[PDB]
Amino acid sequence: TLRAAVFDLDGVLALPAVFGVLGRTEEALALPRGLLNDAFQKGGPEGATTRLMKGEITLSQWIPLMEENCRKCSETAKVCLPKNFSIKEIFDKAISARKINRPMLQAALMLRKKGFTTAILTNTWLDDRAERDGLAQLMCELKMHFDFLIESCQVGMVKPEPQIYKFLLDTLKASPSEVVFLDDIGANLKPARDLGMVTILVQDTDTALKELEKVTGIQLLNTPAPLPTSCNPSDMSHGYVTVKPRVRLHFVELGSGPAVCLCHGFPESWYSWRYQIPALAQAGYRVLAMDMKGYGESSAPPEIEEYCMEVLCKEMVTFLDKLGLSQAVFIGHDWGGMLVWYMALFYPERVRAVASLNTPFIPANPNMSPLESIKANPVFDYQLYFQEPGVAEAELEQNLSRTFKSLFRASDESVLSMHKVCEAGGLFVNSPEEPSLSRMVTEEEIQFYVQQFKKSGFRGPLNWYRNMERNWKWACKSLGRKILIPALMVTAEKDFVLVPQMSQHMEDWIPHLKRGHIEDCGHWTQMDKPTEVNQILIKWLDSDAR
Amino acid sequence: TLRAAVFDLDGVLALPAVFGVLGRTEEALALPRGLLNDAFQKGGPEGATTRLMKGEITLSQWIPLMEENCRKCSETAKVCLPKNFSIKEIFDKAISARKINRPMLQAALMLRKKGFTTAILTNTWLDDRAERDGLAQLMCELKMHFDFLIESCQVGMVKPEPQIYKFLLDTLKASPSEVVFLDDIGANLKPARDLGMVTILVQDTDTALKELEKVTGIQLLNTPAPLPTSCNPSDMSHGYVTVKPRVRLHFVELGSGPAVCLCHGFPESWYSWRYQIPALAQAGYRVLAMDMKGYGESSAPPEIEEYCMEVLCKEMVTFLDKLGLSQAVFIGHDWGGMLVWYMALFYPERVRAVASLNTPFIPANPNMSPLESIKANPVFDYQLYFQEPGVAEAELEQNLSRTFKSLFRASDESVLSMHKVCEAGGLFVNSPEEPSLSRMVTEEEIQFYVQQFKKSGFRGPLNWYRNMERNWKWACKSLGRKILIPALMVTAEKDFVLVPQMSQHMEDWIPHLKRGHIEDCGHWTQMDKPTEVNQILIKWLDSDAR
Ligand SMILES: Cn1cc(-c2ccc3c(c2)[C@@](C)(Cc2ccccc2)C(=O)N3)cn1
């Protein structure tokens, strides 16, 4: 019974295969058949290519050895190579063209999810070309999805030599019969077959995948659309910045490029962005996913005034100051979306671009108290219950697993009334003691939130709602301003509190505003519809945030 | 007696003054004298400009109001404005041209060093222009050097109104006689004078500075070259990445742009890069200053093999993997310089560029044991003393303050023999029990290193030297390779262990190698010669690392 799957890189996990470009160049240049593929394999196990694949020499050192082999091969076949012939140009283009074979990666991901140990086994080189980064990026994206990556140039062994196979078996800690081995080269497949391993000669992906599902007994072809890559908390880079004597802000950091600061809502975590972090980093951004003040590993002082928008924004400015960032794009959800609009209004010089999920920008009415405005809409009545210090804390901290299981549900999974909460005596009245698990979250994901809220509880989080008068007074100073920096408003059809129609007049204050809209999406936007969120954010980032 | 200094921004801390561009435009366009400066101040305290400076409106909203004021002013003077006249273009260029007035900043820095409370008090606007980032960057660089930054548009008060002055006094928590106030506008200087504050009308910097030193009794003009900005540990963003179950790596992070990974030597810290971090971040880089494995807040496992170059490099690759970085430029000193050369040899796809301070790249001799090679040079004899587990640990951990005070000294300050160490019974034999403080370090800086080494001691650090045979065997696999990615070798004239002449044959392996050389520089390169290090690194980064 199989428990490990092994994939080659060239022609298996990545396409078009770099090997096939030798035959393509020949046909394109009307050269004798196999001329380039012959110069490539010249000398066999003692030749330039084997030395390159074993790591004896780098790619830049092999280029002149390949050029000389091409001269020797054209001499024997009695022909002449063109004027502007370049091996570097041919390989630069072939490497650049080669992309991840998405269905093969999906099959490998599915096998690992079901408990398989997966590995990439590849004959590769030490790339020192000026353009080496493109391959480095490709290898990085791929490797993180597998238990092992075995490169010939790092182990000093090469396929089809039998040592690399016994080495593969040793790293897998499995007997040959427990291993499936996929390769596009028959000769390289041969020693694994001869050892007792299940083998698949890969030509077209579809047939290779049919052979793979037949032998593993796991459906890999025509499978439902997979969720985006998530985050394992213990595998992240964790960052800590003291913004003032009693306040430190924690964040998770991934990627390179323009800084993108993700600001969660209530009662959340940096982890609420788990499906966005790998996707935004892969799209070419440096993601900083915050634990907002009052949450997770960030400081949670008790004082109400420590959570007014003025203080929170000032601290986010200091956070950038301390990290040495002149700007960041600010993306917020719920209370984080409110912070992000005020960052744009008060510190436009520090905001590269602004995006909000669900939270609209609504200007302060200076002729009406916020308490009056909130009372007009019965949708916000539950926030009156959050006003009295200690009341909501006691109920929300009573049973954490119940709190999060009840809150984090899709639009059709509602378990909480969320109307007449302040008049029924609680948020959890006529709510199950043991809610079912939502289709949005695993038990493990709920337990992460439970573990985070064990440190500071709900006081700091609830304080974000206790500054209505202070926030309103501050917001009134900005009434003559407009938001003229790049801005995105993302509405969620089924958020019944932060309704899409609340965003309707935003163009009056943000004339250049761009929009996104997600259908059949509830309040917990990022985990409800992760694929669409990522699609919307990446598209806007690439067009408006550089 | 004075204890607080206040500076304006436009015409005082930053030059050329944005105000002076109205008079320059007039002369350049042969328009009536004061025409633009008149349209600028139209309406006085009720006008467009006052509303802008108080934060009622943003810069992008004021532009059309200024255009209309320019039309009304040209009408009265009976003239016509040119065809391609643009207020936006005029202000975009004026803002872009305005740079920090370095001698004024130096004087403010010196005043703060002597115990003064410093503040910037400025009439400014909420910048929402597409090019707002240039000013955001300027404000960021400046503000971090002062105790307070008071902006008119944030406080809703403006100079010369008396409220802003009483507000300034309230924030400074000082009486008017304790405050010096510098401004280029006489009218704005007036209320501070009338309140009892010492005032300076700023025209040319030199005279303003003469007036400033006369009144404070502190030398500010013709003063020695100041050291680059250092790091306050508590003000940094601290990052944490688990690279494997028992290993987490800590780093300090500052700036935006290409990732620059700084790797310290033995027995150091991320703090050894204190003078480089603010300068590299200000030069447009995202600095990641590591605590290398075995040091500070990073994990320090006890096993010797956990510190071989292979393991350390693999972990630095995983560190990049976890942060979502496809590459970083790697800059190392001492043992960090050795790691950085091996990162270039084994993972060129992950290395944007490589730079080493003092440590040369010397290829492994496969016909000679490293122990044989080290014995040939009496300079490396002290490393034989580091071999026996527990021996050097006991002596180096006996008195931490003594350890660091004895080690961290300039070339002429030597207090340790560092020859026949292994034959004299110790590193500290015939060395003072209470060494004097080196000119390179303050007591506070030594105590930082003392505090860091209290967590794990010298075991993990010493283990970096205990993998000679393993490192040599690993290095032999790379003998056929060359380093063809961008590379910098920085030699220090007076490093008597890592001598400049040891780097002489490096071009044989790194043909495209660039160089730097620092005269009168000992082993502790970064703290010995910080200005030259920064100059050399920034110049190479900008030309070779993008
Ligand atoms: C129209 N509308 C307002 C709200 C609303 C609800 C709660 C809170 C607020 C507004 C502010 C941001 C205070 C605030 C109120 C009004 C304007 C600006 C800021 C606050 O601190 N908490 C919902 N609908």
Ligand SMILES: Cn1cc(-c2ccc3c(c2)[C@@](C)(Cc2ccccc2)C(=O)N3)cn1
């Ligand atoms: C010529 N020379 C070598 C050294 C030298 C000194 C100490 C150590 C080493 C080399 C390596 C890196 C081991 C190593 C030795 C030789 C070649 C590669 C690596 C090590 O692990 N520790 C100084 N001069």
